[PDB]
Design an enzyme around this catalytic site. Structure first.
Site, PDB file in Angstrom:
ATOM      1  N   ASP B  41       0.228 -56.922 -35.661  1.00  8.84           N
ATOM      2  CA  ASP B  41      -0.404 -57.390 -34.400  1.00  8.84           C
ATOM      3  C   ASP B  41      -0.089 -58.877 -34.221  1.00  8.84           C
ATOM      4  OD1 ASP B  41      -2.014 -57.238 -32.062  1.00  8.84           O
ATOM      5  OD2 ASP B  41      -3.806 -57.852 -33.182  1.00  8.84           O
TER       6      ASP B  41
HETATM    7  P1  LIG Z   1      -2.631 -60.268 -30.224  1.00  9.07           P
HETATM    8  O1  LIG Z   1      -1.652 -59.251 -29.672  1.00  9.07           O
HETATM    9  O2  LIG Z   1      -3.885 -59.665 -30.825  1.00  9.07           O
HETATM   10  O3  LIG Z   1      -3.106 -61.190 -28.994  1.00  9.07           O
HETATM   11  C1  LIG Z   1      -3.894 -60.578 -27.939  1.00  9.07           C
HETATM   12  C2  LIG Z   1      -4.620 -61.684 -27.180  1.00  9.07           C
HETATM   13  C3  LIG Z   1      -5.511 -62.454 -28.159  1.00  9.07           C
HETATM   14  C4  LIG Z   1      -3.586 -62.644 -26.581  1.00  9.07           C
HETATM   15  C5  LIG Z   1      -5.473 -61.060 -26.067  1.00  9.07           C
HETATM   16  O4  LIG Z   1      -4.637 -60.720 -24.974  1.00  9.07           O
HETATM   17  C6  LIG Z   1      -6.662 -61.871 -25.575  1.00  9.07           C
HETATM   18  O5  LIG Z   1      -7.795 -61.559 -25.931  1.00  9.07           O
HETATM   19  N1  LIG Z   1      -6.430 -62.849 -24.707  1.00  9.07           N
HETATM   20  C7  LIG Z   1      -6.447 -64.258 -25.074  1.00  9.07           C
HETATM   21  C8  LIG Z   1      -7.572 -65.018 -24.414  1.00  9.07           C
HETATM   22  C9  LIG Z   1      -8.918 -64.529 -24.903  1.00  9.07           C
HETATM   23  O6  LIG Z   1      -9.737 -64.038 -24.131  1.00  9.07           O
HETATM   24  N2  LIG Z   1      -9.156 -64.646 -26.213  1.00  9.07           N
HETATM   25  C10 LIG Z   1     -10.281 -64.020 -26.886  1.00  9.07           C
HETATM   26  C11 LIG Z   1     -10.317 -64.378 -28.348  1.00  9.07           C
HETATM   27  S1  LIG Z   1     -10.085 -66.164 -28.539  1.00  9.07           S
HETATM   28  C12 LIG Z   1     -11.668 -66.773 -28.078  1.00  9.07           C
HETATM   29  O7  LIG Z   1     -11.851 -67.461 -27.103  1.00  9.07           O
HETATM   30  C13 LIG Z   1     -12.761 -66.344 -29.014  1.00  9.07           C
HETATM   31  C14 LIG Z   1     -12.612 -66.858 -30.411  1.00  9.07           C
HETATM   32  C15 LIG Z   1     -13.749 -66.423 -31.327  1.00  9.07           C
HETATM   33  C16 LIG Z   1     -13.602 -66.828 -32.775  1.00  9.07           C
HETATM   34  C17 LIG Z   1     -13.496 -68.312 -33.018  1.00  9.07           C
HETATM   35  C18 LIG Z   1     -14.750 -69.083 -32.703  1.00  9.07           C
HETATM   36  C19 LIG Z   1     -14.658 -70.558 -32.997  1.00  9.07           C
HETATM   37  C20 LIG Z   1     -14.830 -70.923 -34.449  1.00  9.07           C
HETATM   38  C21 LIG Z   1     -14.891 -72.409 -34.694  1.00  9.07           C
HETATM   39  C22 LIG Z   1     -15.404 -72.804 -36.055  1.00  9.07           C
HETATM   40  C23 LIG Z   1     -14.695 -72.138 -37.206  1.00  9.07           C
HETATM   41  C24 LIG Z   1     -14.928 -72.824 -38.524  1.00  9.07           C
HETATM   42  C25 LIG Z   1     -16.356 -73.272 -38.720  1.00  9.07           C
END
Ligand SMILES: *P(=O)(O)OCC(C)(C)[C@H](O)C(=O)NCCC(=O)NCCSC(=O)CCCCCCCCCCCCC
Ligand SMILES: CCCCCCCCCCC(CCCCCCCCCC)(CO[C@H]1O[C@@H](CO)[C@H](O[C@@H]2O[C@@H](CO)[C@H](O)[C@@H](O)[C@@H]2O)[C@@H](O)[C@@H]1O)CO[C@H]1O[C@@H](CO)[C@H](O[C@@H]2O[C@@H](CO)[C@H](O)[C@@H](O)[C@@H]2O)[C@@H](O)[C@H]1O
Ligand SMILES: CCCCCCCCCCCCCCCCCC(=O)OC[C@H](COP(=O)([O-])OCC[N+](C)(C)C)OC(=O)CCCCCCCCCCCCCCCCC
Ligand SMILES: CCCCCCCCCCCCCCCCCC(=O)OC[C@H](COP(=O)([O-])OCC[N+](C)(C)C)OC(=O)CCCCCCCCCCCCCCCCC
Ligand SMILES: CCCCCCCCCCCCCCCCCC(=O)OC[C@H](COP(=O)(O)OCCN)OC(=O)CCCCCCCCCCCCCCCCC
Ligand SMILES: CCCCCCCCCCCCCCCCCC(=O)OC[C@H](COP(=O)(O)OCCN)OC(=O)CCCCCCCCCCCCCCCCC
Ligand SMILES: CCCCCCCCCCCCCCCCCC(=O)OC[C@H](COP(=O)(O)OCCN)OC(=O)CCCCCCCCCCCCCCCCC
Ligand SMILES: CCCCCCCCCCCCCCCCCC(=O)OC[C@H](COP(=O)(O)OCCN)OC(=O)CCCCCCCCCCCCCCCCC
Ligand SMILES: CCCCCCCCCCCCCCCCCC(=O)OC[C@H](COP(=O)(O)OCCN)OC(=O)CCCCCCCCCCCCCCCCC
Lengths: 494, 85, 75, 38, 81, 39, 98, 77, 170, 61, 74, 255
Positions: B41
């Site tokens: 992935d």
């Molecule tokens: P791959 O093929 O899996 O990629 C698919 C993607 C990720 C591009 C999807 O199309 C997608 O979900 N779109 C990207 C934009 C989005 O909505 N992202 C969601 C996940 S990223 C987000 O914003 C959430 C992150 C949550 C986890 C991290 C939280 C922060 C932690 C900070 C502190 C850590 C240490 C203390």
């Protein structure tokens, strides 16, 4: 023909030979440069002969020649301890100034050498004349040769520079002339041996002091009256800059010993808190300003302002240590500032054609001889020990602190900022990454000429930094004559 | 004198052998692509690049990480960087 | 560019333009509230403050050969 | 290398023996049981 | 590996990996120059050291062999009875 | 906390015969405890 | 945009999580949670929320920033960075007189 | 017996230690000089010096306790 | 001996740094280590000579600064404290010169590095052997300059440049 | 106050532990093997304790 | 392994020799030359500093008291 | 110097968060630390014991508010002394390998196939020149303190009668240090040293998660950075001292 008159005559013979040799030989330019250099060498040789014969503890002016054919404006020459080392500094510096431009003039070479040789006769005459009007006549005679030197051989802004140094100096000197004429009217004469014997009234001394101090403040220069130095010392040719910083700055310092300490001691004592406020202000404002200066020669020119404030504070301390420190710092600044202008205006500016500090980086990697001398001169400009710059700074600052502690502490702070701006410049040029990506061509290191005009300057400061007695031995008795005060139990022996 | 291709491939091949998300160790070769050959992935490829950077003691910029979509691309990147250990 | 040929430098236009602006800046100074206050702080007040302290404390002390039972205050 | 293990153990053998030697003699004094003169 | 460096740069410290073929010879001549100055300094320090206390004869004071102040004292002190 | 809980001195200040006045520089210098005020 | 940022921001989460936790074994299970949250939001496709979600996690990334993150020695900020930089131009200076 | 200034000064005893019980330290410092201050050679002399100092300290602690009660258990430092 | 402890690190630093081309890398390491070791041994004797037998040694060479009341001489004075501090200074310096034979084996500036290490030892020895505050301050500024040159030894690194200015200015 | 991202500090605090299952377990298993086991790493924590204790007992006869 | 010492002193390439601009003659023999000659004459120069004249008088005036000892009393 | 061996051992790298193992890779290098560490934390009957564990006692020996207060301050500093002592020792030798596998790859374990002569780099130790000072300095950290404690402390030592150092009689507090001090406070630094080591040694490799729980709280995060950012005596220095001068220079040149 006194040895002192020989000093003023040799550079005039060199002018004659330079401007007539073509009638005896198209003469090559190398010939003119060799005539001029040998001329200054024989002048140095005569000043060394005088120093051997000079006596360290005589209150009579030495090597004076009897005139006895009195006129209105006669030239009497004589030397004592306070003038002997300024004469030596002028004779040592000028050959170095000639070599520092050997290759970088390339046009009007005859005019450059004649102007340089004439400047030597005038500057020497300043330190040797035994009359206060005679002093003024030579202090000012150097402006037209200085005006034409900058305009003929200066950089892009040499028109504004030459006007600034001419008009500042004249305007201040005109106020010094007014004070000098008042003295001659009251006394009838400006000869040293009889004018110092006189006693001026307090308010006369007060108004005599302002007139003289206005000129000495333009020439120190003090901060706020120093625009001319920023322009002239940078826009001048390298030889001009060396002479301007290492000799011309000293005339006001030597002039404080002959024009205010002996005749205006009450005014000097009662006005020190004004001299010290200006002196303290100049130490801080200049030091902060040169920290932000981006032209390398202007940074080095601006350092002269900060150090000149320290020996200006020394001469007004009324102490043996401050006065000796002031001459030793003025001498030390002569060698070190000469080397720093050769490093900037001679070495860097000939390779790159620019003086902006933004374009230099990592020069140590390709130029380890330049950096070795540059660092030693950056240490000396920071007052590091085993340089004559430390002995002068410590003695000058001790006198300032003892005469008035609040000014001493503030002037002391220069120990931080001199180091600060000197080492910061050194790192942005010699260190601070690898060689600057702006250089397309690689650079060569010091030529033999550049190595030996720097080795000579760093030798003088270091040897005098380890054994300053060479100079202090000939200042102890004469410096004593300019002190004003008495002890409760030593005064009025019976 | 520095790092040769044979050594980099072994370290990389032994690195992916310990990954469960890889379909099998037998599909690893020189021209392998993480996307379709080993079936990883987008998140798995980011984990793989971090493991490669830790193994060779180098920091990969985000732009370079996007460029590494193949095992061969990773080997070339390690060879290009002199600092790689 | 100068009288004696130097090495070829990559004379950056931006840095050249910056070094010219500095050399010409004096032509564009103006009297405003800000420029009058700063120019009055540095030239008058701070110098007159030091002059006040220097004047007020001139002769206040002597350290030479001072002993116990003898003060440093001279005035 | 084998001489490194000898030096590492040897330095650690001279140590942990100096402590025990000094503890056997100077231990009563440090802990206050017996004054140094006794 | 060794970093590349310009061959045209002359530094008195030697530069990047300088070791002349005659390094053993030059290291011996400079040692002799170093030795002679120390001998010159040692002779000076023997002559001009100042001490207001004299070491006892039995104690380990190796300077008594080469310094003048102690040697003159011990020579004079040997005259007894 | 330490100001409200710190042990008082558990030894009288030592007294030197004659106050060591001569050995410390005569009456013009600072001498040691000699039959002085209790502390 | 919204693809490169998500992958790069994901990597910084793994780095920062390991920056505060020296031990790697505790960092492993520390990482599955970080990976899991990205799986939970893999189905979001609305641009008005996709850019908003990236803002929250970068703010959260700054919320727990390490006083000094790790850097390899030969990387920007490392100890050996530019320790013995070579002379850029190895070509001899052109013949001139000074 | 008690050592007076006429030979205590000659012995170069440290000024802070020219106390009543300094007569046992003159031979100890001589032993220290002879044995190169090695802390296993002048044990007998070193322990002898620690006796008089400790006894005078014990004499002083009693005086301090007497002073403390005199002021009703106040603070003397 | 007393004045040989002064000049020997100085000579070792001058030859290594100003003639690193002549003696080469190994020639420099041989002189700086030998000069420091010979100097180190002499200090051990000086500890016995001065500390143990209680002979303070006064050595005055020539006047440095002479103005009316100030007579500052290049004078050295050995007493118990200066030989106490000369022991670790020389011993660790001997061990650091020897240690650096390996640590800097890949450095392309070995002669300069060893020149600096012997100059610092000279400046440390001057600081504690001086018999006045002014000459002591020379070693005070001396070790400071040697500290600045040894921090900025890798002068192409911008962050080590900021460090040396912090060392110099603070 | 839950965030748009489901990041909870309490379970983030809880998760810090050796996971039961990990895709990278096989790659990162050599850090706890026989060479770097709990006993082996602390086996040589005090090098000469064994030798010194034996020697001291011999000297205490 | 070590490199042989390299580099061009004064910029002189290994093929040729340093060329003289004409300053070397007067500078090395007139300027420095006279500066060593003067140094030699300075060793033989009589000492006329006020201090040594004063220490001699300060000595006798101190010998009149008990601070110093007269080498030739009375 | 021994530390320098560690940076030379792995990659010219010096970050704690990537150090581990190395207890068997660098046996001698580890050993010299332990002698140095206990001398630094003033373990009984070591070189640092006779100096460090006499300053603290001297402070109580002077019976005053200033003397007692600095004891408490120094002891707390002495308490925190052994923790980084433990951190240096544990995180580089007694912990799990946190660095890359390149550091820990011995030729005994068969890993490569063709490039067997090279590409191992198993974090070897130094040569003779690197270890000879290491061994020599080890003895000074055990026996030099005990041997010379009579010259420098003694009871009435006359090693400074040449006046080199000077102590006024009214300021002497050494007599009370040996006798007046109570035994509990004399051995108190040792009790904390031998105790707080075990908590630090238990907080890692035994618990190993109590600290991270403190780290990720809001109270711990603010404390951790403050101490990691060195009390912030360089952020106010750089901004309110250094750049003030730089702006002062700016105003003077421009206005
Ligand atoms: P791959 O093929 O899996 O990629 C698919 C993607 C990720 C591009 C999807 O199309 C997608 O979900 N779109 C990207 C934009 C989005 O909505 N992202 C969601 C996940 S990223 C987000 O914003 C959430 C992150 C949550 C986890 C991290 C939280 C922060 C932690 C900070 C502190 C850590 C240490 C203390
Ligand atoms: C910075 C300029 C300093 C220039 C030095 C001038 C040289 C000395 C002249 C100062 C002057 C007027 C000053 C007026 C204001 C000065 C300028 C105002 C601001 C300048 C823009 C003092 O003038 C006062 O002198 C006093 C006596 O000393 C008298 O008492 C006063 O009555 C008299 O007014 C002239 O007095 C002088 O003249 C001589 C006769 O040759 C007399 O003998 C004295 O009378 C002498 O003192
Ligand atoms: C600065 C360059 C000068 C020429 C360069 C060549 C010499 C450079 C210095 C090298 C070392 C010289 C000192 C070595 C000391 C060894 C002992 C010794 O020889 O002493 C003999 C003499 C001292 O002998 P003395 O102290 O025993 O007694 C004679 C001197 N009287 C009587 C006056 C006290 O030392 C010298 O003469 C050295 C002189 C060096 C330079 C002197 C001043 C030069 C600068 C003059 C201009 C200053 C103002 C500038 C503006
Ligand atoms: C007070 C002013 C100075 C007075 C003393 C003057 C020198 C006296 C003797 C000093 C000891 C010998 C120093 C040799 C240093 C190595 C030689 C060298 O310069 O190599 C250039 C080296 C070249 O060595 P390199 O061999 O590595 O060069 C090739 C490699 N590159 C070019 C990349 C570097 O250039 C540098 O890297 C450093 C530039 C600055 C050089 C400063 C050296 C020290 C200068 C003397 C310091 C004096 C301290 C005085 C302290 C005052 C105390 C109060
Ligand atoms: C004083 C007496 C002469 C002192 C100079 C002696 C040194 C000397 O010989 O200089 C020679 C100088 C240049 O040498 P030259 O060979 O003539 O030039 C060849 C260039 N292709 O030839 C010259 O032209 C130098 C002339 C110097 C004139 C004396 C110095 C002028 C000041 C006199 C006072
Ligand atoms: C001790 C008291 C002394 C009193 C004064 C005594 C005389 C001092 C000198 C005064 C003027 C002397 C002039 C000497 C040079 C005359 C000879 C000459 O012709 O030189 C010509 C020279 C070069 O020109 P040229 O070679 O002919 O053209 C070549 C073009 N490819 O061209 C030049 O050299 C011109 C040089 C520039 C002008 C000289 C410097 C400015 C002088 C300003 C003059 C007004 C002030 C006078 C000050 C006198 C000293 C105080
Ligand atoms: C390495 C670092 C070594 C430690 C550094 C600190 C040194 C001082 C620490 C304490 C040392 C204590 C002294 C050790 C030896 C004590 C001793 O008693 O040695 C005897 C030796 C003989 O000297 P002497 O005075 O002539 O004896 C006459 C007695 N009838 O007395 C001596 O003087 C012999 C020792 C001379 C050593 C010279 C070494 C030159 C190298
Ligand atoms: C560097 C070592 C210089 C040589 C040290 C000893 C020189 C000497 O023998 O004395 C020459 C002279 C006399 O020393 P003086 O200062 O007058 O007072 C001493 C009291 N007897 O004192 C001098 O003139 C020494 C002059 C030294 C000049 C600096 C040398 C720098 C060398 C680089
Ligand atoms: C100990 C005395 C502490 C008093 C309580 C201080 C306190 O708890 O303030 C809260 C603050 C929380 O940290 P904060 O970043 O503001 O969290 C924001 C989350 N919305 O937490 C803090 O600010 C505590 C700051 C601790 C560092 C202070 C310097 C060290 C003090 C050691 C004692």
């Amino acid at each position: 023909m006194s040895l002192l008159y020989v000093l003023l005559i040799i550079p005039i013979i060199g002018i004659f030979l330079i401007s007539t040799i073509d009638s005896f030989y198209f003469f090559n330019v190398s010939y003119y440069k060799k005539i001029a250099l040998i001329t200054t060498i024989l002048n140095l040789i005569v000043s060394l002969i005088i120093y051997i014969l000079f006596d360290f503890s005589n209150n009579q002016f030495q090597f004076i020649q009897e005139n006895l054919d009195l006129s209105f404006y006669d030239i009497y020459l004589g030397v004592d301890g306070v003038s002997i080392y300024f004469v030596l500094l002028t004779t040592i510096i000028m050959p170095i100034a000639l070599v520092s431009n050997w290759n970088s003039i390339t046009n009007n070479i005859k005019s450059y050498l004649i102007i340089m040789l004439l400047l030597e006769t005038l500057l020497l005459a300043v330190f040797l004349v035994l009359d206060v009007l005679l002093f003024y006549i030579f202090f000012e005679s150097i402006l037209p040769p200085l005006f034409i030197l900058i305009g003929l051989f200066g950089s892009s802004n040499k028109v504004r520079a030459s006007f600034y140094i001419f008009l500042y100096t004249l305007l201040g000197s005109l106020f010094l002339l007014l004070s000098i004429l008042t003295m001659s009217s009251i006394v009838g004469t400006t000869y040293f041996d009889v004018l110092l014997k006189s006693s001026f009234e307090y308010t006369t001394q007060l108004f005599l002091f302002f007139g003289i101090f206005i000129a000495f403040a333009v020439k120190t220069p003090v901060w706020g009256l120093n625009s001319w130095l920023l322009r002239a010392h940078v826009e001048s040719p390298l030889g001009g800059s060396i002479v301007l910083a290492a000799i011309v700055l000293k005339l006001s310092l030597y002039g404080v010993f002959r024009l205010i300490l002996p005749i205006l001691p009450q005014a000097s004592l009662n006005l020190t808190y004004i001299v010290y406020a200006i002196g303290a202000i100049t130490v801080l404002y200049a030091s902060f300003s040169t920290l932000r200066t981006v032209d390398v020669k202007e940074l080095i020119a601006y350092s002269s302002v900060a150090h000149a404030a320290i020996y200006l504070m020394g001469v007004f301390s009324n102490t043996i240590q401050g006065l000796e420190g002031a001459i030793l710092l003025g001498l030390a600044h002569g060698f070190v500032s000469s080397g720093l202008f050769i490093c900037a205006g001679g070495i860097l500016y000939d390779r790159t054609g620019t003086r902006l500090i933004y374009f230099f980086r990592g020069l140590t990697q390709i130029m380890p001889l330049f950096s070795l001398f540059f660092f030693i001169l950056c240490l000396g400009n920071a007052g590091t020990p085993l340089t004559l710059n430390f002995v002068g700074e410590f003695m000058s600052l001790y006198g300032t602190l003892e005469r008035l502690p609040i000014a001493g502490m503030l002037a002391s702070t220069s120990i931080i900022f001199s180091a600060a701006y000197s080492i910061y410049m050194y790192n942005r040029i010699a260190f601070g990454g690898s060689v600057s990506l702006y250089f397309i061509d690689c650079f060569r290191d010091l030529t033999k000429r550049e190595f030996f005009i720097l080795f000579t300057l760093v030798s003088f400061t270091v040897i005098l930094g380890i054994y300053p007695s060479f100079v202090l031995d000939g200042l102890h008795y004469n410096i004593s004559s300019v002190v004003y005060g008495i002890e409760p139990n030593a005064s009025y022996l019976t | 004198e520095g790092l040769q291709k044979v050594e980099v491939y072994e370290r990389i091949k032994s690195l992916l052998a310990g990954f469960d998300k890889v379909n099998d160790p037998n599909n690893i070769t020189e021209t392998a692509h993480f996307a379709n050959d080993l079936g990883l992935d987008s998140l798995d490829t980011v984990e793989v690049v971090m493991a490669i950077e830790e193994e060779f003691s180098i920091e990969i910029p985000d732009k370079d990480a996007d460029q590494i979509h193949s095992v061969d691309k990773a080997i070339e990147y390690i060879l290009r960087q002199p600092d790689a250990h | 560019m100068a009288g004696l040929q130097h090495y070829k430098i990559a004379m950056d236009p931006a840095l050249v333009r910056l070094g010219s602006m500095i050399s010409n800046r004096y032509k564009y100074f103006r009297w405003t509230k800000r420029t009058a206050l700063v120019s009055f702080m540095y030239v008058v007040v701070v110098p007159s403050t030091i002059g006040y302290l220097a004047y007020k404390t001139d002769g206040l002390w002597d350290l030479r050969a001072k002993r116990r039972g003898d003060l440093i205050s001279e005035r | 290398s084998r001489v490194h293990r000898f030096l590492a153990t040897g330095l650690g053998a001279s140590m942990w023996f100096w402590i025990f030697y000094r503890a056997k003699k100077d231990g009563p004094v440090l802990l206050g049981w017996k004054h140094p003169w006794d | 590996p060794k970093i590349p460096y310009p061959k045209h740069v002359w530094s008195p410290a030697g530069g990047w990996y300088a070791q002349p073929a005659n390094w053993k010879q030059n290291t011996a001549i400079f040692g002799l120059v170093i030795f002679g100055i120390t001998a010159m300094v040692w002779k000076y320090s023997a002559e001009h050291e100042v001490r207001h206390k004299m070491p006892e004869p039995d104690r380990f004071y190796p300077s008594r062999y080469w310094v003048k102040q102690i040697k003159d004292y011990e020579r004079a002190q040997k005259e007894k009875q | 906390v330490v100001k409200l809980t710190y042990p008082d001195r558990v030894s009288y200040p030592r007294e030197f015969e004659g106050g060591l006045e001569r050995e410390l520089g005569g009456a013009g210098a600072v001498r040691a405890f000699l039959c002085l005020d209790d502390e | 945009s919204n693809r490169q940022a998500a992958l790069s921001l994901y990597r910084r989460a793994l780095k920062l999580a390991l920056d505060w936790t020296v031990h790697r074994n505790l960092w492993r299970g520390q990482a599955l949670y970080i990976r899991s949250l990205f799986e939970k939001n893999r189905n979001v496709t609305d641009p008005r929320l996709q850019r908003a979600l990236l803002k929250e996690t970068e703010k959260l990334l700054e919320k727990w920033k390490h006083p000094d993150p790790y850097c390899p020695p030969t990387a920007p900020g490392g100890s050996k960075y530019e320790r013995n930089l070579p002379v850029p131009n190895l070509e001899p200076p052109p013949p001139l007189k000074f | 017996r008690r050592a007076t200034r006429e030979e205590m000064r000659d012995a170069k005893v440290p000024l802070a230690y020219r106390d009543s019980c300094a007569h046992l330290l003159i031979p100890l410092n001589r032993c220290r000089y002879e044995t190169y201050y090695l802390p296993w050679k002048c044990e007998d002399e070193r322990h002898s010096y620690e006796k008089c100092q400790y006894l005078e300290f014990k004499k002083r602690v009693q005086k301090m306790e007497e002073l403390r009660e005199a002021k009703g258990g106040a603070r003397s430092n | 001996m007393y004045l040989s402890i002064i000049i020997l690190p100085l000579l070792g630093s001058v030859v290594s740094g100003f003639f690193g081309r002549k003696v080469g890398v190994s020639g420099a390491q041989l002189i700086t280590c030998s000069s420091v070791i010979i100097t180190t041994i002499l200090s051990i004797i000086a500890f016995f000579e001065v500390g143990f037998n209680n002979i303070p040694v006064t050595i005055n060479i020539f006047r440095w600064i002479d103005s009316e009341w100030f007579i500052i001489n290049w004078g050295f004075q050995y007493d118990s404290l200066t030989v106490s501090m000369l022991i670790p200074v020389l011993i660790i310096s001997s061990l650091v010169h020897i240690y650096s034979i390996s640590y800097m084996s890949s450095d392309p500036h070995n002669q300069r590095f060893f020149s600096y290490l012997s100059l610092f030892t000279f400046m440390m020895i001057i600081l504690v052997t001086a018999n006045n505050y002014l000459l002591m301050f020379v070693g005070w500024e001396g070790v400071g300059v040697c500290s600045y040159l040894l921090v900025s030894f890798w002068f192409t690194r911008i962050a080590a440049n900021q460090s040396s200015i912090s060392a110099f200015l603070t | 106050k839950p965030n748009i991202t489901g990041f909870d500090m309490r379970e983030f605090l809880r998760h810090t532990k050796t996971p039961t299952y990990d895709p990278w377990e096989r790659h990162e298993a050599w850090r706890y093997t026989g060479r770097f086991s709990r006993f082996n790493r602390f086996k040589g924590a005090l090098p000469g304790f064994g030798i010194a204790t034996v020697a001291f007992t011999a000297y205490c006869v | 392994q070590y490199d042989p010492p390299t580099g061009w002193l004064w910029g002189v390439r290994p093929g040729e020799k340093y060329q003289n601009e004409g300053w070397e003659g007067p500078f090395f023999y007139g300027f420095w030359g006279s500066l060593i000659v003067f140094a030699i004459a300075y060793a033989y120069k009589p000492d006329t500093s006020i201090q040594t004249w004063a220490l001699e008088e300060a000595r006798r005036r101190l010998e009149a008291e008990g601070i110093l000892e007269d080498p030739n009393p009375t | 110097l021994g530390a320098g061996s560690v940076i030379h051992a792995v990659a010219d790298n010096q970050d704690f968060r990537k150090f581990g193992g190395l207890i068997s890779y660098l046996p001698l290098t580890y050993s010299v630390m332990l002698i140095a560490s206990l001398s630094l934390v003033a373990f009984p009957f070591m070189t640092g014991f006779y100096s460090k564990d006499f300053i603290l006692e001297s402070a109580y020996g002077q019976f005053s508010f200033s003397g007692v207060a600095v004891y408490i301050i120094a002891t707390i500093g002495a308490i925190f002394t052994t923790l980084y002592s433990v951190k240096v020792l544990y995180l580089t030798f007694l912990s799990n390998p946190n660095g890359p596998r390149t550091y820990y790859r011995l030729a005994i374990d068969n890993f490569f196939s063709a490039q067997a002569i090279k590409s191992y780099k198993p974090a070897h130790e130094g040569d003779f020149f690197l270890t000879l000072p290491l061994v020599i300095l080890a003895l000074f950290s055990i026996f030099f303190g005990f041997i010379t404690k009579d010259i420098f402390i003694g009871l009435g030592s006359n090693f400074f009668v040449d006046n080199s150092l000077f102590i006024h009689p009214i300021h002497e507090i050494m007599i009370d240090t040996e006798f007046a001090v109570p035994v509990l406070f004399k051995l108190l630094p040792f009790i904390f040293t031998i105790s707080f080591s075990v908590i630090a040694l238990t907080l890692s490799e035994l618990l190993s998660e109590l600290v991270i729980y403190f780290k990720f709280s809001r109270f711990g995060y603010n404390i951790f950075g403050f101490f990691n950012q060195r009390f912030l005596i360089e952020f106010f220095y750089n901004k309110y001292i250094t750049n003030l001068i730089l702006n002062l220079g700016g105003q003077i040149t421009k206005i």
